Amino acid sequence: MFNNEPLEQIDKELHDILADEEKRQRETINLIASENLTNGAVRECLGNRVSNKYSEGYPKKRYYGGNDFIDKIEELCQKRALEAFNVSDEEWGVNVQPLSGSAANVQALYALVGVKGKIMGMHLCSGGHLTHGFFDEKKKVSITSDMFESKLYKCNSQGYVDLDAVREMALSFKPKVIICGYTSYPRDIDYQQFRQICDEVNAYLFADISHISSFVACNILNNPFLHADVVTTTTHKILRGPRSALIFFNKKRNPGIEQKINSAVFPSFQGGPHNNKIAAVACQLKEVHSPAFKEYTQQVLLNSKALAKALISKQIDLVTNGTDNHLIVVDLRKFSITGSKLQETCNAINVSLNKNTIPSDVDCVSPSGVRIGTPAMTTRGAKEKDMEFIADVLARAIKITVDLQEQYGKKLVDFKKGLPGNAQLQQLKQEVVTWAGALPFP
Amino acid sequence: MFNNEPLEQIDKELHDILADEEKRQRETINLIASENLTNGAVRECLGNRVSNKYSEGYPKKRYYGGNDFIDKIEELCQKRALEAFNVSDEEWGVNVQPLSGSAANVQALYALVGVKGKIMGMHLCSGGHLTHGFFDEKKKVSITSDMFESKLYKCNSQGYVDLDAVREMALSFKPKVIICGYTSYPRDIDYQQFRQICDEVNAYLFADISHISSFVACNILNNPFLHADVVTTTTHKILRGPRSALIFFNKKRNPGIEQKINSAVFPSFQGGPHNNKIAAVACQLKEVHSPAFKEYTQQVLLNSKALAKALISKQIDLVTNGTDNHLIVVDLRKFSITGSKLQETCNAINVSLNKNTIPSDVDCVSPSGVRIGTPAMTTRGAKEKDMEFIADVLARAIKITVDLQEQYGKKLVDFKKGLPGNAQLQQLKQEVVTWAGALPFP
Ligand SMILES: Cc1[nH]nc2c1[C@](c1cc(N3CCC(CC(=O)O)CC3)cc(C(F)(F)F)c1)(C(C)C)C(C#N)=C(N)O2
Ligand SMILES: Cc1[nH]nc2c1[C@](c1cc(N3CCC(CC(=O)O)CC3)cc(C(F)(F)F)c1)(C(C)C)C(C#N)=C(N)O2
Ligand SMILES: Cc1ncc(COP(=O)(O)O)c(CNCC(=O)O)c1O
Ligand SMILES: Cc1ncc(COP(=O)(O)O)c(CNCC(=O)O)c1O
Ligand SMILES: [Cl-]
């Protein structure tokens, strides 16, 4: 008693918007540092009937019947996760049920510290995430600043994590957890030093490696599994999986954490797992372990180095004057424009990027930069030689943005009136499309 | 720089488990009240490249570029949600970004009362959800009993909601929210009478209609939208959509609730929305509004009545001795067997159900019943005349379970040794598969 007519016939309205979204993705230079494109095998999982199953609990301990094949999928995902990040099932555990990044981080924090527990994370304005305790003087913006007591550590004026400040803060504030691993931080993390500060004050070491996960798994960047008690990560960014998250916990260093983390996920916060996600994660984690994926990940940093280098050669300032990973933050103060403005200008030419704060900015309204990153375009086949072209396009967008500000003024509402019809933007878009639309599309 | 080999080639191991899940689903009598089967159109959306997009925030106010077609999908889903539940976009708003039911309920309660806030909900043992403030004397099982202060109202020994107790509890406890709508409660709700109690102590009226959503939409059961301040609902049960959730808020009765709920979802708890979900929910919400889905929903209650009636005529006791909705709770005390045992017996014959508490039980270990429901089988084309057979299979399961208890004893580990190879279980399984494997499978 159902309708099995295809999507095209059942819902032509929705199907057209998705055919459109598909074309837009195909014809865009995607520089969002947090975005990638999944292969068809991961999209077959997400489409799979396994999402019919309620399977609350953990494998073998299900509150529903008919979970025989679900428990295998869940166990196969856990194994492949522990295998992908080069850790032993003897000392490291993994929960694979968190629905996304922010859910995973709030759950893992809760497990460790409980309500009104004390936590430390990097400031949003300095590169830290919302779920790292972010608040404003005016409001508790993240739940992690309200359901927990949080304190935030700023980076230095050059854009680097100030370990002198972290230690000054940890001794006075005395938190149960210290968060590192970040949302828009272009450099590597000394986890060892974080461990020594955590050990000084008997706080837990929390490393959220969502942005840099692939690098960690492939031993291109520092390994926080050597020092951290908990490691959180999303699966949908550089790792190139579905939208999901993973909580890793260190059993050797903290026995009985397994029960605490598992109980935090369910039944503390979530109910039924999303099994199509779990299936999809499993499929991408087998890819993560291959030598082919290492090659891709290497290409990400190769492209990122080249991109930063080509932007500096065109006199554009970068936060920390470069990058160790997949991402760059462009400081736009020398041009007297904002990232809100450059994001719209880039939206008009099919260049996807996001506004981003910098160290000198006192407000998240009027951010003075944009962040870009290479995972997506590296997935589309772009090489080091291609980065000059992307640098060329970003430079012209900045120049066009200066002109449109000159003509129409600093107000953003006024600035947008400048965008539609602009001949240079039309010629530039045309250039973006012609090149982007040609690349391999998964 | 990717692998576009299909799932079968890239991951034969996983592909075989999913082909196996597919066959199990096809050859099972699914009586899990919370489960359904999604059509191929809903499954195309979940597999769609729209899940590549980071679109944090709300439509027109995105922290990322390239969100033009995503904004159309998110506004189209909101439209179709308000349309489906027969509410005016002037009076009611809807957030469509919650990732699942438990996330939606925690977020909405936060919006309303905040950390340390007071809430009231039905006890788990009486039919209420974990997210309705459930705790135990030992521990705060749900975050909703820890991040909030909760008190729990039980039903009487008859299995019915006791409004005398609710009011008595509300006057003394004075919560800011009162939750109604439930997980395994077989009768309709007097929302109007809940509204009268909420107004007396100036509390919000929270209706969670996840289990009964389709009835509310198609006007077969009471309408909480006439009285409630907030309505939550999952989209993956009787509504027959993807795994997602929806928070409805009454703007007219509570000016300023819109921002407060929209900010609880993001940036308070979640980050990037899962767009494939939103696409999928939009697709099913169009189906919900047709007269054909009303037909399906009517057939759900026709089957439920017949199923209750046919179980009573085989001398099986039901809580409240019947049902007004899609679900029944079988009380198994007279047979001296637990729900755990009957769930295992039923899994050996390809009958999916779940264990469930009843009013007389003091513990959730050793629950005295099981819960069943008709949404899934009604989707597969089963009619009233088919319910006698399901009732007969369940009767035979109960009988077999008493025998297996008699032979191997009360211990559950001992009991399962009895299951493998049993001649009448093989005979019954055979009978289950033959009928189930013949029915329409979306
Ligand atoms: C949207 C989001 N989530 N997590 C983030 C961000 C980022 C971000 C957040 C905000 N927020 C998002 C929530 C907002 C609170 C509200 O809405 O009431 C406070 C500022 C603002 C910006 C930018 F605009 F660039 F300054 C960027 C980026 C990645 C989009 C960010 C930065 N900078 C960092 N560090 O992390
Ligand atoms: C799994 C789950 N989620 N929400 C539910 C349930 C149900 C349920 C929950 C529990 N729980 C789940 C959390 C558990 C807490 C812990 O581990 O520390 C306490 C008992 C136990 C049962 C049953 F076994 F039948 F008694 C049923 C059902 C629908 C599966 C339930 C009941 N009865 C109700 N009312 O709601
Ligand atoms: C370090 C980090 N942690 C957690 C999250 C949360 O992920 P979900 O979006 O799945 O909740 C993000 C999101 N990153 C935002 C961005 O960098 O674009 C992040 O950067
Ligand atoms: C009333 C109610 N509310 C919320 C949820 C949470 O849904 P998620 O599983 O999407 O978190 C459930 C699921 N209850 C499980 C069941 O009845 O089988 C529920 O019954
Ligand atoms: Cl999904």
PDB file of N, CA, C and O in Angstrom, chain A residues 275-317:
ATOM      1  N   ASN A 275      21.520   3.545  10.658  1.00  0.00           N
ATOM      2  CA  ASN A 275      22.303   2.413  10.177  1.00  0.00           C
ATOM      3  C   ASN A 275      22.840   2.593   8.785  1.00  0.00           C
ATOM      4  O   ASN A 275      23.910   2.084   8.464  1.00  0.00           O
ATOM      5  N   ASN A 276      22.096   3.304   7.942  1.00  0.00           N
ATOM      6  CA  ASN A 276      22.590   3.691   6.625  1.00  0.00           C
ATOM      7  C   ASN A 276      23.870   4.536   6.742  1.00  0.00           C
ATOM      8  O   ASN A 276      24.781   4.410   5.924  1.00  0.00           O
ATOM      9  N   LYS A 277      23.956   5.382   7.762  1.00  0.00           N
ATOM     10  CA  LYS A 277      25.212   6.104   8.032  1.00  0.00           C
ATOM     11  C   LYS A 277      26.318   5.155   8.370  1.00  0.00           C
ATOM     12  O   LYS A 277      27.438   5.305   7.869  1.00  0.00           O
ATOM     13  N   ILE A 278      26.021   4.226   9.279  1.00  0.00           N
ATOM     14  CA  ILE A 278      27.020   3.294   9.773  1.00  0.00           C
ATOM     15  C   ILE A 278      27.528   2.443   8.604  1.00  0.00           C
ATOM     16  O   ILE A 278      28.720   2.360   8.378  1.00  0.00           O
ATOM     17  N   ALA A 279      26.614   1.873   7.831  1.00  0.00           N
ATOM     18  CA  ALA A 279      26.973   1.212   6.592  1.00  0.00           C
ATOM     19  C   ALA A 279      27.864   2.106   5.710  1.00  0.00           C
ATOM     20  O   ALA A 279      28.896   1.668   5.238  1.00  0.00           O
ATOM     21  N   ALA A 280      27.492   3.368   5.521  1.00  0.00           N
ATOM     22  CA  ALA A 280      28.293   4.273   4.679  1.00  0.00           C
ATOM     23  C   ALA A 280      29.680   4.527   5.251  1.00  0.00           C
ATOM     24  O   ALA A 280      30.659   4.572   4.505  1.00  0.00           O
ATOM     25  N   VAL A 281      29.763   4.672   6.562  1.00  0.00           N
ATOM     26  CA  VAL A 281      31.040   4.911   7.208  1.00  0.00           C
ATOM     27  C   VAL A 281      31.938   3.712   6.965  1.00  0.00           C
ATOM     28  O   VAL A 281      33.113   3.885   6.619  1.00  0.00           O
ATOM     29  N   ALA A 282      31.374   2.507   7.103  1.00  0.00           N
ATOM     30  CA  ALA A 282      32.122   1.283   6.933  1.00  0.00           C
ATOM     31  C   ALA A 282      32.734   1.247   5.556  1.00  0.00           C
ATOM     32  O   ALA A 282      33.906   0.942   5.416  1.00  0.00           O
ATOM     33  N   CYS A 283      31.944   1.577   4.544  1.00  0.00           N
ATOM     34  CA  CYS A 283      32.416   1.607   3.148  1.00  0.00           C
ATOM     35  C   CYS A 283      33.575   2.586   2.906  1.00  0.00           C
ATOM     36  O   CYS A 283      34.483   2.312   2.130  1.00  0.00           O
ATOM     37  N   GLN A 284      33.550   3.734   3.568  1.00  0.00           N
ATOM     38  CA  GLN A 284      34.600   4.702   3.349  1.00  0.00           C
ATOM     39  C   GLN A 284      35.850   4.353   4.153  1.00  0.00           C
ATOM     40  O   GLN A 284      36.966   4.641   3.713  1.00  0.00           O
ATOM     41  N   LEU A 285      35.667   3.761   5.330  1.00  0.00           N
ATOM     42  CA  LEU A 285      36.809   3.327   6.125  1.00  0.00           C
ATOM     43  C   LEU A 285      37.665   2.234   5.467  1.00  0.00           C
ATOM     44  O   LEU A 285      38.861   2.155   5.751  1.00  0.00           O
ATOM     45  N   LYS A 286      37.089   1.413   4.585  1.00  0.00           N
ATOM     46  CA  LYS A 286      37.910   0.480   3.821  1.00  0.00           C
ATOM     47  C   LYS A 286      38.749   1.229   2.804  1.00  0.00           C
ATOM     48  O   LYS A 286      39.895   0.844   2.548  1.00  0.00           O
ATOM     49  N   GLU A 287      38.172   2.258   2.183  1.00  0.00           N
ATOM     50  CA  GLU A 287      38.954   3.145   1.320  1.00  0.00           C
ATOM     51  C   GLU A 287      40.069   3.842   2.085  1.00  0.00           C
ATOM     52  O   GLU A 287      41.170   3.940   1.589  1.00  0.00           O
ATOM     53  N   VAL A 288      39.791   4.325   3.286  1.00  0.00           N
ATOM     54  CA  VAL A 288      40.780   5.086   4.046  1.00  0.00           C
ATOM     55  C   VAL A 288      42.069   4.285   4.241  1.00  0.00           C
ATOM     56  O   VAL A 288      43.151   4.872   4.160  1.00  0.00           O
ATOM     57  N   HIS A 289      41.960   2.961   4.418  1.00  0.00           N
ATOM     58  CA  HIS A 289      43.138   2.109   4.686  1.00  0.00           C
ATOM     59  C   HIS A 289      44.031   1.767   3.482  1.00  0.00           C
ATOM     60  O   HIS A 289      45.222   1.530   3.659  1.00  0.00           O
ATOM     61  N   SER A 290      43.465   1.768   2.280  1.00  0.00           N
ATOM     62  CA  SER A 290      44.218   1.574   1.038  1.00  0.00           C
ATOM     63  C   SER A 290      45.391   2.554   0.852  1.00  0.00           C
ATOM     64  O   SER A 290      45.418   3.630   1.483  1.00  0.00           O
ATOM     65  N   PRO A 291      46.372   2.174  -0.005  1.00  0.00           N
ATOM     66  CA  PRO A 291      47.449   3.110  -0.334  1.00  0.00           C
ATOM     67  C   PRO A 291      46.999   4.194  -1.335  1.00  0.00           C
ATOM     68  O   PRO A 291      47.614   5.263  -1.380  1.00  0.00           O
ATOM     69  N   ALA A 292      45.946   3.920  -2.112  1.00  0.00           N
ATOM     70  CA  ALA A 292      45.323   4.925  -2.994  1.00  0.00           C
ATOM     71  C   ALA A 292      44.812   6.192  -2.273  1.00  0.00           C
ATOM     72  O   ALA A 292      44.833   7.279  -2.857  1.00  0.00           O
ATOM     73  N   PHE A 293      44.325   6.041  -1.038  1.00  0.00           N
ATOM     74  CA  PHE A 293      43.771   7.154  -0.278  1.00  0.00           C
ATOM     75  C   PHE A 293      44.889   7.985   0.322  1.00  0.00           C
ATOM     76  O   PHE A 293      44.805   9.206   0.361  1.00  0.00           O
ATOM     77  N   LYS A 294      45.935   7.316   0.803  1.00  0.00           N
ATOM     78  CA  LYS A 294      47.169   8.003   1.222  1.00  0.00           C
ATOM     79  C   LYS A 294      47.653   8.944   0.109  1.00  0.00           C
ATOM     80  O   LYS A 294      47.966  10.109   0.378  1.00  0.00           O
ATOM     81  N   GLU A 295      47.654   8.445  -1.131  1.00  0.00           N
ATOM     82  CA  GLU A 295      48.042   9.251  -2.293  1.00  0.00           C
ATOM     83  C   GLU A 295      47.162  10.502  -2.406  1.00  0.00           C
ATOM     84  O   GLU A 295      47.687  11.601  -2.592  1.00  0.00           O
ATOM     85  N   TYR A 296      45.843  10.326  -2.280  1.00  0.00           N
ATOM     86  CA  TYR A 296      44.890  11.452  -2.301  1.00  0.00           C
ATOM     87  C   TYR A 296      45.208  12.476  -1.207  1.00  0.00           C
ATOM     88  O   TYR A 296      45.294  13.684  -1.488  1.00  0.00           O
ATOM     89  N   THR A 297      45.393  11.989   0.022  1.00  0.00           N
ATOM     90  CA  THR A 297      45.657  12.838   1.196  1.00  0.00           C
ATOM     91  C   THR A 297      46.948  13.607   1.036  1.00  0.00           C
ATOM     92  O   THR A 297      47.054  14.738   1.494  1.00  0.00           O
ATOM     93  N   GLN A 298      47.942  12.969   0.431  1.00  0.00           N
ATOM     94  CA  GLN A 298      49.221  13.613   0.173  1.00  0.00           C
ATOM     95  C   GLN A 298      48.986  14.750  -0.792  1.00  0.00           C
ATOM     96  O   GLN A 298      49.472  15.865  -0.567  1.00  0.00           O
ATOM     97  N   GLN A 299      48.221  14.463  -1.847  1.00  0.00           N
ATOM     98  CA  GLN A 299      47.843  15.480  -2.827  1.00  0.00           C
ATOM     99  C   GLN A 299      47.123  16.700  -2.203  1.00  0.00           C
ATOM    100  O   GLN A 299      47.303  17.838  -2.685  1.00  0.00           O
ATOM    101  N   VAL A 300      46.352  16.478  -1.127  1.00  0.00           N
ATOM    102  CA  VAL A 300      45.647  17.581  -0.459  1.00  0.00           C
ATOM    103  C   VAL A 300      46.628  18.619   0.070  1.00  0.00           C
ATOM    104  O   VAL A 300      46.449  19.824  -0.168  1.00  0.00           O
ATOM    105  N   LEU A 301      47.633  18.139   0.808  1.00  0.00           N
ATOM    106  CA  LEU A 301      48.681  19.001   1.376  1.00  0.00           C
ATOM    107  C   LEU A 301      49.572  19.557   0.264  1.00  0.00           C
ATOM    108  O   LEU A 301      49.944  20.708   0.330  1.00  0.00           O
ATOM    109  N   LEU A 302      49.887  18.763  -0.759  1.00  0.00           N
ATOM    110  CA  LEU A 302      50.654  19.268  -1.914  1.00  0.00           C
ATOM    111  C   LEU A 302      49.893  20.461  -2.497  1.00  0.00           C
ATOM    112  O   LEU A 302      50.475  21.505  -2.704  1.00  0.00           O
ATOM    113  N   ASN A 303      48.584  20.310  -2.700  1.00  0.00           N
ATOM    114  CA  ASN A 303      47.761  21.366  -3.317  1.00  0.00           C
ATOM    115  C   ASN A 303      47.657  22.557  -2.412  1.00  0.00           C
ATOM    116  O   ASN A 303      47.716  23.677  -2.873  1.00  0.00           O
ATOM    117  N   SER A 304      47.538  22.305  -1.116  1.00  0.00           N
ATOM    118  CA  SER A 304      47.415  23.372  -0.148  1.00  0.00           C
ATOM    119  C   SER A 304      48.664  24.232  -0.064  1.00  0.00           C
ATOM    120  O   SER A 304      48.565  25.439   0.026  1.00  0.00           O
ATOM    121  N   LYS A 305      49.831  23.596  -0.057  1.00  0.00           N
ATOM    122  CA  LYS A 305      51.145  24.288  -0.047  1.00  0.00           C
ATOM    123  C   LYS A 305      51.282  25.162  -1.280  1.00  0.00           C
ATOM    124  O   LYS A 305      51.576  26.356  -1.178  1.00  0.00           O
ATOM    125  N   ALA A 306      51.037  24.557  -2.436  1.00  0.00           N
ATOM    126  CA  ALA A 306      51.071  25.279  -3.707  1.00  0.00           C
ATOM    127  C   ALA A 306      50.091  26.462  -3.748  1.00  0.00           C
ATOM    128  O   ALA A 306      50.454  27.541  -4.245  1.00  0.00           O
ATOM    129  N   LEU A 307      48.888  26.291  -3.183  1.00  0.00           N
ATOM    130  CA  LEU A 307      47.867  27.340  -3.205  1.00  0.00           C
ATOM    131  C   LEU A 307      48.245  28.547  -2.353  1.00  0.00           C
ATOM    132  O   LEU A 307      48.114  29.701  -2.787  1.00  0.00           O
ATOM    133  N   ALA A 308      48.701  28.277  -1.134  1.00  0.00           N
ATOM    134  CA  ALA A 308      49.253  29.301  -0.241  1.00  0.00           C
ATOM    135  C   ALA A 308      50.418  30.037  -0.881  1.00  0.00           C
ATOM    136  O   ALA A 308      50.538  31.258  -0.778  1.00  0.00           O
ATOM    137  N   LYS A 309      51.279  29.268  -1.543  1.00  0.00           N
ATOM    138  CA  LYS A 309      52.476  29.799  -2.159  1.00  0.00           C
ATOM    139  C   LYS A 309      52.107  30.731  -3.315  1.00  0.00           C
ATOM    140  O   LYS A 309      52.652  31.828  -3.438  1.00  0.00           O
ATOM    141  N   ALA A 310      51.156  30.302  -4.142  1.00  0.00           N
ATOM    142  CA  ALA A 310      50.700  31.125  -5.265  1.00  0.00           C
ATOM    143  C   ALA A 310      49.915  32.382  -4.810  1.00  0.00           C
ATOM    144  O   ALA A 310      49.990  33.412  -5.481  1.00  0.00           O
ATOM    145  N   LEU A 311      49.205  32.312  -3.682  1.00  0.00           N
ATOM    146  CA  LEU A 311      48.510  33.493  -3.125  1.00  0.00           C
ATOM    147  C   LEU A 311      49.481  34.516  -2.542  1.00  0.00           C
ATOM    148  O   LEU A 311      49.267  35.725  -2.668  1.00  0.00           O
ATOM    149  N   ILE A 312      50.534  34.032  -1.879  1.00  0.00           N
ATOM    150  CA  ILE A 312      51.583  34.917  -1.360  1.00  0.00           C
ATOM    151  C   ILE A 312      52.337  35.586  -2.508  1.00  0.00           C
ATOM    152  O   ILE A 312      52.643  36.778  -2.426  1.00  0.00           O
ATOM    153  N   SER A 313      52.596  34.842  -3.575  1.00  0.00           N
ATOM    154  CA  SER A 313      53.254  35.413  -4.760  1.00  0.00           C
ATOM    155  C   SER A 313      52.426  36.535  -5.444  1.00  0.00           C
ATOM    156  O   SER A 313      52.995  37.358  -6.188  1.00  0.00           O
ATOM    157  N   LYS A 314      51.104  36.548  -5.190  1.00  0.00           N
ATOM    158  CA  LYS A 314      50.194  37.661  -5.545  1.00  0.00           C
ATOM    159  C   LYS A 314      49.879  38.571  -4.342  1.00  0.00           C
ATOM    160  O   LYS A 314      48.809  39.177  -4.275  1.00  0.00           O
ATOM    161  N   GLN A 315      50.800  38.668  -3.393  1.00  0.00           N
ATOM    162  CA  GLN A 315      50.744  39.677  -2.313  1.00  0.00           C
ATOM    163  C   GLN A 315      49.512  39.593  -1.392  1.00  0.00           C
ATOM    164  O   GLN A 315      49.112  40.582  -0.769  1.00  0.00           O
ATOM    165  N   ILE A 316      48.936  38.400  -1.277  1.00  0.00           N
ATOM    166  CA  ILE A 316      47.815  38.158  -0.374  1.00  0.00           C
ATOM    167  C   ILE A 316      48.377  37.556   0.912  1.00  0.00           C
ATOM    168  O   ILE A 316      49.148  36.605   0.865  1.00  0.00           O
ATOM    169  N   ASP A 317      47.979  38.144   2.040  1.00  0.00           N
ATOM    170  CA  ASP A 317      48.370  37.688   3.364  1.00  0.00           C
ATOM    171  C   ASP A 317      47.544  36.500   3.847  1.00  0.00           C
ATOM    172  O   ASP A 317      46.305  36.500   3.732  1.00  0.00           O
TER     173      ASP A 317
END
